[PDB]
């Protein structure tokens, strides 16, 4: 798992 | 304390600034957390790094192009993966006439432009880069090692979650955005703007977070049907005028290079970059967070979303409730106004 900033 | 739940700014002395966790407890004693977001201006004598001129070759492995779709203060942002690029190249684009910050006088002007133009000329965000710009020798507020209890995850189970217990770098350009969200596991986050143009923020008080959620489900009912936690997808943008129209309390703040923003458990926030800049961020925790993590409502619909086992936190810090919780019988109601237990001092 990772932090992600963006939707898709 | 802070009954208006307005965003507070803090100017700690080097003496107060030295102990990270301690100071977070202090700003919570002053009601900072009620706003969901707080700013902290470091002692002027303090710098995390000497010069930024040597980073031009730093690789941004996965830039994303932000395509925003929608109207009338309600948008869904889509991300397009772009090939890797160096900071040097990125800056060229950010400053290029095509992508550069427009002209303006007062922030309110730039803000109206953001909300008018955000669905046009999709910008590129240098987001989620693994790494740190801190010099190894800097021991105050080091996003690389903050030494909060969030460290227990790694210490106990050896598990690393990038961006959460490790640092990220963000290279922004005008009109790049972060949609409305709280943190993974409703943790805190810390955000330091290393240099460049401002980053503006919006925030909803944790005590009002459920109202924002309900509003959002109403605006995007299909999305709420598909996933409860859909806001965690980080695709949802909502303008301040829309919040106003629906009576969601919120506050705004602009973060300038050299300043820290802190976000607090279950504080919803969103924002945009003014122009070329660079920020470093990660998550962290306090004892007060523990109950938030236990109750966090998480994204169901995507695989491998960040999920942290609370077991270690409950055993260590709530031994008296452990058996109850493991039994599904723990009824604790969160009071958003109450400061972290460390603020007793
Ligand atoms: O620091 C944060 O909590 C945050 O939301 N940062 C975003 C990345 S999601 C940003 O600076 O664009
Ligand atoms: Ni955030
Ligand atoms: Zn989901």
């Amino acid at each position: 798992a990772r932090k992600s900033c963006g939707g898709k | 304390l802070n009954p208006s739940a307005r965003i507070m700014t803090f100017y700690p002395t080097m003496e107060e600034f030295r102990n990270f966790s301690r100071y977070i407890a202090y700003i919570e004693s002053q009601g900072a957390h009620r706003a969901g977001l707080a700013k902290v201006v470091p002692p002027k004598e303090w710098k995390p790094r000497a010069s930024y001129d040597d980073i031009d070759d730093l690789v941004i492995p996965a830039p994303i192009q932000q395509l925003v779709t929608g109207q009338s203060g309600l948008f869904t942002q889509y991300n397009i993966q772009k090939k890797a690029m160096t900071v040097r190249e990125f800056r060229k684009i950010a400053n290029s006439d095509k992508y550069c910050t427009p002209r303006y006088s007062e922030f309110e002007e730039l803000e109206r432009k953001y909300w008018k133009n955000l669905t046009f000329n999709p910008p590129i965000y240098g987001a989620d880069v693994n790494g740190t710009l801190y010099e190894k020798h800097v021991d105050e507020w080091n996003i690389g090692r903050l030494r909060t209890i969030l460290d227990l995850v790694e210490k106990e189970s050896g598990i690393t979650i990038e961006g959460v217990n490790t640092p990220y770098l963000y290279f922004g350009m005008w009109k790049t955005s972060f949609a409305w969200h709280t943190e993974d596991m409703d943790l805190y986050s810390i955000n330091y703007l290393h240099f460049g143009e401002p980053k503006s923020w919006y925030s909803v008080p944790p005590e009002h977070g459920k109202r924002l959620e309900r509003l959002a489900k109403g605006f995007f009912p299909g999305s709420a049907q598909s996933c409860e936690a859909f806001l965690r997808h980080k695709m949802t943008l909502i303008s301040p005028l829309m919040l106003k129209k629906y009576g969601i309390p919120f506050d705004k703040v602009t973060q300038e290079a050299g300043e820290f923003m802190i976000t607090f458990p279950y504080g919803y926030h969103a924002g945009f970059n003014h122009g070329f800049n660079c920020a470093e961020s990660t998550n962290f925790a306090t004892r007060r967070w523990i109950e938030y993590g236990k109750q966090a409502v998480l994204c169901s619909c995507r695989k491998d979303m960040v999920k942290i086992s609370m077991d270690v936190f409950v055993r260590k810090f709530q031994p008296e409730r452990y058996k109850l919780w493991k039994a599904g019988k723990d009824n604790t109601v969160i009071d958003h106004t109450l400061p972290t237990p460390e603020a007793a001092e």
Side-chain angles (χ1 to χ4, degrees), chain A, chain B residues 1-14 16-17 19-43 45-46 48-87 89-91 93-102 104-322 324-345:
Chain A
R2 58 188 297 274
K3 168 178 178 189
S4 172
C5 291
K8 185 173 91 76
Chain B
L1 272 167
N2 189 23
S4 64
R6 291 295 303 290
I7 292 159
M8 299 175 68
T9 299
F10 289 88
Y11 299 79
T13 63
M14 178 67 66
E16 310 166 277
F17 186 72
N19 191 338
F20 174 73
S21 57
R22 186 153 169 260
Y23 200 77
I24 297 301
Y26 168 73
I27 66 184
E28 292 195 344
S29 68
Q30 309 291 290
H33 53 114
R34 299 190 62 174
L37 190 63
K39 171 190 289 177
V40 179
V41 177
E45 70 215 60
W46 180 93
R49 190 185 179 103
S51 173
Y52 300 89
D53 305 315
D54 48 13
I55 68 175
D56 306 316
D57 306 313
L58 200 169
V59 175
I60 305 167
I64 60 184
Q65 179 169 47
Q66 302 182 315
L67 207 148
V68 181
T69 67
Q71 57 174 354
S72 304
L74 298 181
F75 309 92
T76 298
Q77 169 172 271
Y78 291 88
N79 309 110
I80 306 168
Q81 266 285 1
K82 303 295 291 181
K83 59 178 173 48
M85 66 174 69
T86 67
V87 172
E89 310 173 76
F90 187 87
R91 186 201 308 121
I93 311 174
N95 295 137
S96 87
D97 302 333
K98 182 178 186 184
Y99 300 93
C100 69
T101 310
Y104 82 100
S105 318
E106 310 299 317
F107 159 84
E108 298 62 42
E109 187 181 356
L110 187 56
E111 172 179 24
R112 281 190 300 277
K113 287 195 173 196
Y114 168 79
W115 288 110
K116 172 181 170 185
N117 308 350
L118 79 173
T119 77
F120 310 135
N121 187 37
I124 294 159
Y125 201 9
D128 304 331
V129 179
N130 290 307
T132 172
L133 302 189
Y134 276 69
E135 286 162 354
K136 58 69 179 175
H137 50 75
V138 163
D139 298 340
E140 313 81 7
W141 285 56
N142 197 316
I143 289 166
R145 39 181 168 95
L146 290 173
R147 301 284 108 89
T148 73
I149 67 170
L150 181 64
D151 285 347
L152 281 172
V153 182
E154 231 275 23
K155 284 206 177 193
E156 175 93 12
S157 75
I159 295 175
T160 81
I161 310 156
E162 305 191 310
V164 178
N165 58 16
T166 74
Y168 272 174
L169 291 169
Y170 295 89
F171 298 97
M173 75 171 61
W174 157 241
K175 204 146 69 61
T176 58
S177 310
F178 52 105
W180 281 102
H181 68 282
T182 66
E183 299 308 299
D184 287 311
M185 292 306 299
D186 295 342
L187 287 154
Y188 300 67
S189 58
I190 177 176
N191 192 115
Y192 179 78
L193 195 55
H194 277 290
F195 61 79
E197 299 297 298
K199 182 193 298 285
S200 288
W201 302 63
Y202 300 96
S203 183
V204 169
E207 50 204 78
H208 304 294
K210 284 297 171 181
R211 175 143 49 138
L212 175 74
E213 282 174 12
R214 173 215 240 259
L215 189 64
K217 295 177 198 318
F219 295 145
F220 303 91
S223 304
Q225 257 224 36
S226 308
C227 172
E228 178 65 356
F230 83 96
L231 286 178
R232 295 201 189 270
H233 303 164
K234 289 184 193 158
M235 302 170 78
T236 304
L237 291 56
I238 305 172
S239 69
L241 291 183
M242 279 300 301
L243 295 197
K244 279 194 64 176
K245 187 185 309 305
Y246 288 89
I248 309 311
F250 72 96
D251 196 7
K252 42 185 103 173
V253 66
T254 295
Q255 165 191 26
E256 276 136 354
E259 301 176 356
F260 289 89
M261 300 309 308
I262 299 285
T263 82
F264 297 85
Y266 199 64
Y268 270 102
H269 52 282
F272 65 89
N273 294 301
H274 290 200
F276 182 67
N277 64 10
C278 169
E280 177 168 345
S281 181
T282 196
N283 287 125
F284 67 89
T286 67
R287 282 163 62 198
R288 188 170 70 85
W289 160 76
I290 296 174
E291 194 59 43
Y292 287 83
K294 290 167 62 206
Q295 306 189 11
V297 182
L298 300 198
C299 170
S300 22
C301 71
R302 303 187 165 171
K303 60 177 63 286
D304 201 24
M305 288 300 82
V306 171
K307 175 171 188 181
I308 298 183
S309 170
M310 298 304 296
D311 192 88
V312 73
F313 294 97
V314 186
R315 272 194 275 96
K316 174 159 183 183
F317 301 89
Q318 311 178 335
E320 82 285 12
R321 296 133 77 186
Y322 183 77
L324 203 96
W325 170 71
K326 217 59 190 185
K329 274 184 170 47
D330 193 349
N331 293 322
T332 312
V333 186
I334 294 176
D335 164 18
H336 295 297
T337 79
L338 180 62
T340 199
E342 298 100 309
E345 180 183 12

